[PDB]
């Protein structure tokens, strides 16, 4: 169920400064490379330790690629101002997501190439890698321009070929590091909250990767319509945190059981309130 | 490796 993704951003700035360009590469949703035009000495930089493998030429040529992309976004931003007949002295964002999904058979599942202007979908390559979807009229100008130049043939060639070739290479190079997981340590807390009722809250900490499920249940059944759940959040050390919580009556806390499902867990933890 | 674009928008 594997993937590569390169996320790219350009931001216009009113005044003397050219647009800021940031490119981030992801393997299996794990950041491994970054480029930032605002850096002191702008180049692609490794992020995971397993990329220090690659030699000077890799960095040097990827850095040269970035610098061409930078100009590409600079020119694309300008053209877009013209299309939407926008005024000068604004800050506008251009964004690109691009990559390939992969089976365990090392075979292309899906190719992705899409753009957004001002956080709205602008243009995207369709699943076939041959045709385009244009969100508005300005995008339709682009679509025509790209049909006449034969752009999709070239994106296709990158996606089916080079994206996939390179995703293979990266998974072989950092096999030990993507394997890593961290078990949730979980506990329950008790928060005399109102008059009559309490809050029970199931924490899960120290865990990686981020994906996780927490469930409260009362005597067989699952309590989804009366539960409060928080978006999963990073600790900042590499691990993650999440908690789920329920509003129960005092005295009957032993009835309720929390449950925690995770990849790195050899079996799902079940939990109950203790004094 | 990273994608590279062709014609500008």
């Amino acid at each position: 169920p594997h993937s590569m993704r390169y996320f790219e951003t350009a931001v216009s700035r009113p005044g003397l400064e050219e647009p800021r360009y940031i490119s981030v590469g992801y393997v299996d949703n794990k950041e491994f490379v970054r480029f930032d035009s605002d850096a002191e000495n702008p180049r692609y930089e490794p992020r995971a330790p397993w990329m220090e493998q690659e030699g000077p030429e890799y960095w040097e040529r990827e850095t040269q690629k970035a610098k061409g992309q930078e100009q590409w976004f600079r020119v694309s931003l300008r053209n877009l101002l013209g299309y939407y007949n926008q005024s000068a002295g604004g800050s506008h964002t251009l964004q690109q997501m691009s990559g390939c999904d992969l089976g365990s058979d090392w075979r292309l599942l899906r190719g992705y190439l899409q753009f957004a202007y001002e956080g709205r979908d602008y243009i995207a390559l369709n699943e076939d890698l041959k045709t385009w979807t244009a969100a508005d009229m300005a995008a339709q100008i682009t679509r025509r321009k790209w049909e006449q130049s034969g752009a999709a043939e070239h994106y296709k060639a990158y996606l089916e070929g080079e994206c996939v070739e390179w995703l293979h290479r990266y998974l072989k190079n950092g096999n030990a590091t993507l394997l890593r997981t961290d078990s949730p340590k979980a506990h329950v807390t008790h928060h005399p909250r109102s008059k009559g009722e309490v809050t029970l809250r199931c924490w899960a900490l120290g865990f990686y990767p981020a994906d996780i499920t927490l469930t409260w249940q009362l005597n067989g059944e699952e309590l989804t319509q009366d539960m409060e759940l928080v978006e999963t959040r990073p600790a900042g050390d590499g691990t993650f945190q999440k908690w789920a919580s329920v509003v129960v009556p005092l005295g009957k806390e032993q009835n309720y059981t929390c449950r925690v499902y995770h990849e790195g867990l050899p079996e799902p933890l079940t939990l109950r309130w203790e004094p | 490796k990273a994608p590279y674009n062709f014609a500008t928008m």
Partner: T-cell receptor
Amino acid sequence: DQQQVRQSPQSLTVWEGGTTVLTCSYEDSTFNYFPWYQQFPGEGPALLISILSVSDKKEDGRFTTFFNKREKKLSLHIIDSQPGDSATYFCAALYGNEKITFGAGTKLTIKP
Amino acid sequence: AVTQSPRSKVAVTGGKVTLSCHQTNNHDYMYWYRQDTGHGLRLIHYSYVADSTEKGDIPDGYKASRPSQENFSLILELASLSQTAVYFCASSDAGGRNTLYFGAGTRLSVLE
């Protein structure tokens, strides 16, 4: 130093009606886009036809290019050689969005 | 359209010579190329925006200049005999693999 694109021959004269074969070798195995540029006397170079690594042949009518990744060589074949076709033909290669790298160019005279 | 001037130029060794180019493609990338007796297209200087220029493969003895987006100029401060050659301007959209549109050429003889 580093002949990244080697073109042969330098001048090629052929009798009208023949087929011309220009050949080209590149060093950098990563190159994955190869345009050919055609230069009529007194005019500037202009793009003739192009092929990507992923294909083995591209053909626009009379002109047709042959990529071959393994032997790391590329070639142009013109089939009904008219004198209109007399010009310098330039072989090019590049990776990704790097800048184009031209050959020294083969001068083709199609004798009428 | 890419349009150079002057179309021909004679100069004395040590003179100042200045080749000019204009284009109306609204392209950001512009280029100065050198050809030697019909062979070769070696890059001297290019530019992806005014008022900056960047070094090419053969910059020694040459200096470029990009006042407008429309105009691009190559400048020889002291012309040598070895800078006798034909020169081509080109333009292209930013991004990868865009086609070079070349001017029609400028001939330069440099003489003792």
